[PDB]
Curated annotation (Swiss-Prot), chain A:
Molecular function GO terms recorded: protein-macromolecule adaptor activity; transcription corepressor binding
Subunit text: Heterotrimer of an A (ELOA, ELOA2 or ELOA3P), ELOB and ELOC subunit. The elongin BC complex interacts with EPOP; leading to recruit the elongin BC complex to Polycomb group (PcG) target genes, thereby restricting excessive activity of the PRC2/EED-EZH2 complex.
Function text: SIII, also known as elongin, is a general transcription elongation factor that increases the RNA polymerase II transcription elongation past template-encoded arresting sites. Subunit A is transcriptionally active and its transcription activity is strongly enhanced by binding to the dimeric complex of the SIII regulatory subunits B and C (elongin BC complex).
Organismal lineage: Eukaryota, Metazoa, Chordata, Craniata, Vertebrata
Protein name: Elongin-C
Tissue: Overexpressed in prostate cancer cell line PC-3 and breast cancer cell line SK-BR-3.
PTM: Ubiquitinated by the DCX(AMBRA1) complex, leading to its degradation by the proteasome.
An example Gene Ontology CC term for this record: elongin complex
Natural source organism: Homo sapiens
Compartments reported by the entry: Nucleus
Gene: ELOC
UniProtKB/Swiss-Prot annotation, chain B:
Shown chain mapped onto the complete sequence: 62 to 206 of 213
Protein name, entry field: von Hippel-Lindau disease tumor suppressor
Effect ascribed to mutating residue 28 to P: In VHLD; type I
Effect of residue 50 to N: In VHLD; type I
Effect annotated for changing residue 53 to R: In VHLD; type I-II
Swiss-Prot record, chain C:
Cellular compartment(s): Nucleus
CDD domains: Ubl_ElonginB
Role: SIII, also known as elongin, is a general transcription elongation factor that increases the RNA polymerase II transcription elongation past template-encoded arresting sites. Subunit A is transcriptionally active and its transcription activity is strongly enhanced by binding to the dimeric complex of the SIII regulatory subunits B and C (elongin BC complex).
Protein name: Elongin-B
Modified residues (N-acetylmethionine): 1
Gene3D superfamilies: Phosphatidylinositol 3-kinase Catalytic Subunit, Chain A, domain 1
Quaternary state and interactors: Heterotrimer of an A (ELOA, ELOA2 or ELOA3P), ELOB and ELOC subunit. The elongin BC complex interacts with EPOP; leading to recruit the elongin BC complex to Polycomb group (PcG) target genes, thereby restricting excessive activity of the PRC2/EED-EZH2 complex. (Microbial infection) Following infection by HIV-1 virus, component of a cullin-5-RING E3 ubiquitin-protein ligase complex (ECS complex) hijacked by the HIV-1 Vif protein.
InterPro entries, A to Z: ELOB, Ubiquitin-like_dom, Ubiquitin-like_domsf
Metabolic or biological pathway, per its Swiss-Prot or TrEMBL entry: Protein modification; protein ubiquitination
Entry keyword Nucleus: yes
Organism from which the protein derives: Homo sapiens
Example of a GO MF term: ubiquitin protein ligase binding
Length: 90, 145, 104
C-alpha cells in the first residue's frame, strides 16, 4: 500500500493508506493538486485521529452484508469533528 | 408514483432489526402516504403479514435517520417459496462522517439552541434540516424518473 | 481475522490492519516499509509490556473484539538509536475543549 502522512495543527503525524485518505475529496485535491504529506492548520490531533478511524471504518464496512456497528463520537469532540467532516467532505 | 400495489396476495415477512436503533417500519399505502407501524427494539425480529408489491422503508423511530433494508432503501415483499417467509434485514448504512456528527449534535442540543452553537451559519441549516420520510419520498420519486 | 491498529511513537501514529495469526516480527516488517527502520532497531509494546517477535498478534491480545476499525488497538513503538533503545514515549493527542452549556 502507498501510505500518506496527514499532520494535525499540533504536529501529530498520522500515516494512513492513500486509498483510505482518498475517502476525502478535499484530501484527494490537496495530494493531487490541479506530494505524500498534507498539513491541517485547523484540525487538532484529537479530531484528526477520529477522522482516520472513520476512513478505516468506511473502507471496511462499505458494500458489506456483515452487520454494521455504529461509528461512535464522544460529545466532547462532536462540534470540532463536524467542522472537520464539513471541510473534508466525508 | 411510489405506492404499494393492491395485489391482495399475502406475503409473509420477517423484519429483522440488525441495527442498534429503535426501528420505525413505514408502509407506503395505495395513495403513497407513509403509514407508521409499531417500532422494533434493537437486535429484535417480528413476523408480519404483508402483500406482494407492497412498499416498506425503515427509519430510526426517534430521529428518522435513514436505515437500509437488504442493503437498499425500499423493501417489496415477493412470492413465498415453500411457505418460507422473506427476510427484511434492517441495518445501519455507512453514514458520511458529517451526517454522523449532525446526528450526535442533534441528540445533545434542543433545536431552540442550534442558533447558540459556535459554528458557521450553513451548519445551523444542516442541523435544522432533520431527516424526514416526506423529503426522501420526494428525492426517490425524482430518482425513479 | 483482521485486527485494526494504531502503531504509536512520539508524535507518529500509523493506522494499519494485520491478521490475528500474523507475528510481532511481521508487524516490524510493516513498520520497516513505512518508517525505514529494520526490525532489529524496533521494540513493540502492548501498554508497558514488551512483545516477543515470534508471538502472534492474537497471543499478544490483539483480537477482532479489541482491535476494531472504528476503535483500533494501540501498539507502542521504540527505536534503537545506535547502541541502545530509547524509552517507550507516546505523545498524547490534544485535549478537547469544555462541553458548551447547551450540550450539557
Ligand atoms: C390489524 O391488527 C393486527 C395488527 O396488524 C399488523 C401489525 C403489524 Cl406490526 C404488521 C402487520 C399488521 C397487519 C396484520 N398487516 C398489515 O397491516 C399489512 C402490512 C402492509 O402490507 C399493509 N397491510 C394491510 O393489511 C393492508 C391491506 C389489506 C389488504 C387486503 N391489502 O393491504 C391495509 C389496508 C392495512
Amino acid at each position: 500500500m502507498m501510505y500518506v502522512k496527514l499532520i494535525s495543527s499540533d504536529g501529530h503525524e498520522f500515516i494512513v493508506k492513500r486509498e483510505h485518505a482518498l475517502t476525502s475529496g478535499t484530501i484527494k485535491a490537496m495530494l493531487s493538486g490541479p506530494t505524500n504529506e498534507v498539513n491541517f492548520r485547523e484540525i487538532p490531533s484529537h479530531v484528526l485521529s477520529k477522522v482516520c478511524m472513520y476512513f478505516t471504518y468506511k473502507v471496511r464496512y462499505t458494500n458489506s452484508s456483515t452487520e454494521i456497528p455504529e461509528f461512535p463520537i464522544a460529545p466532547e469532540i462532536a462540534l470540532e469533528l463536524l467542522m472537520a467532516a464539513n471541510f473534508l467532505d466525508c | 408514483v411510489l405506492r404499494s400495489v393492491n395485489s391482495r396476495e399475502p406475503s409473509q415477512v420477517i423484519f429483522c432489526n440488525r441495527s442498534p436503533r429503535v426501528v420505525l417500519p413505514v408502509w407506503l399505502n395505495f395513495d403513497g402516504e407513509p403509514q407508521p407501524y409499531p417500532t422494533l427494539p434493537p437486535g429484535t425480529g417480528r413476523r408480519i403479514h404483508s402483500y406482494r408489491g407492497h412498499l416498506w422503508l425503515f427509519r430510526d423511530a426517534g430521529t428518522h435517520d435513514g436505515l437500509l433494508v437488504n442493503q437498499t432503501e425500499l423493501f417489496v415483499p415477493s412470492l413465498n417459496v415453500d411457505g418460507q417467509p422473506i427476510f427484511a434485514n434492517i441495518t445501519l448504512p455507512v453514514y458520511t462522517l458529517k451526517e454522523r456528527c449532525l446526528q450526535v449534535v442533534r441528540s445533545l442540543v434542543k433545536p431552540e439552541n442550534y442558533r447558540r452553537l459556535d459554528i458557521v451559519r450553513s451548519l445551523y441549516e444542516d442541523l435544522e434540516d432533520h431527516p424526514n420520510v416526506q423529503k426522501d419520498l420526494e428525492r426517490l420519486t425524482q430518482e425513479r424518473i | 481475522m483482521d485486527v485494526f491498529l494504531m502503531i504509536r511513537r512520539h508524535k507518529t501514529t500509523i493506522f494499519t490492519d494485520a491478521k490475528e495469526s500474523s507475528t510481532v516480527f511481521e508487524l516490524k516488517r510493516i513498520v520497516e516499509g513505512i518508517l525505514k527502520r529494520p526490525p532489529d532497531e524496533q521494540r513493540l509494546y502492548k501498554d508497558d509490556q514488551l512483545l516477543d517477535d515470534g508471538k502472534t498478534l492474537g497471543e499478544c491480545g490483539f483480537t477482532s473484539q479489541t482491535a476494531r476499525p472504528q476503535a483500533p488497538a494501540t501498539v507502542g513503538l521504540a527505536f534503537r538509536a545506535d547502541d541502545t533503545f530509547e524509552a517507550l514515549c507516546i505523545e498524547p493527542f490534544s485535549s478537547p475543549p469544555e462541553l458548551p452549556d447547551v450540550m450539557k
